[PDB]
């Protein structure tokens, strides 16, 4: 899986 998909939620702001 991609650990960026679950972070993009907050990483995208």
Curated annotation (Swiss-Prot):
It is found in: Secreted; Target cell membrane; Target cell, Target cell cytoplasm. It comes from the Eukaryota. GO terms for cellular component: extracellular region; membrane; other organism cell membrane. This is Temporin-1Ta. Its main location: secreted. Expressed by the skin glands. GO terms for molecular function: lipid binding. Forms helical oligomeric structures in LPS lipids, the major constituent of Gram-negative bacteria outer membrane. Adopts monomeric helical conformations when bound to bacterial (anionic) and eukaryotic (zwitterionic) model membranes. In Gram-positive bacterial mimetic membranes, the aggregation is weakly pronounced, and penetration proceeds more rapidly and is deeper than in Gram-negative bacterial mimetic membranes where aggregation is high. Self-association is prevented by temporin-L. The keyword Membrane applies. Adopts helical conformation in LPS micelles fro residues L4-I12. The keyword Membrane applies. Keywords: Amidation, Amphibian defense peptide, Antibiotic, Antimicrobial, Antiviral protein, Immunity, Innate immunity, Lipid-binding, Membrane, Pharmaceutical, Secreted, Target cell cytoplasm, Target cell membrane, Target membrane. Belongs to the frog skin active peptide (FSAP) family. Temporin subfamily. The lineage of its organism: Eukaryota, Metazoa, Chordata, Craniata, Vertebrata. Signal peptide: none annotated. Could be used to protect potato plants from fungi Phytophthora infestans, Phytophthora erythroseptica and bacterium Erwinia carotovora, since the analog N-terminally modified MsrA3 (F1MASRHMF), when expressed in potato plants, conveys strong resistance to late blight and pink rot phytopathogens in addition to the bacterial pathogen Erwinia carotovora. Transgenic tubers remained disease-free during storage for more than 2 years. It comes from Rana temporaria (European common frog). The modification Leucine amide is found at residue 13. GO terms for biological process: defense response to bacterium; innate immune response; regulation of defense response to virus. Amphipathic alpha-helical antimicrobial peptide with potent activity against Gram-positive bacteria, weak activity against Gram-negative bacteria, and moderate activity against fungi. Mainly acts by causing membrane permeabilization. Is also able to kill S.aureus (both wild-type and MRSA) that are internalized in human keratinocytes without injuring host cells. Rapidly inactivates both channel catfish herpesvirus (ED(50)=15 uM) and frog virus 3 (ED(50)=58 uM) over a wide temperature range. Also displays anti-leishmania activity by damaging parasite membrane.
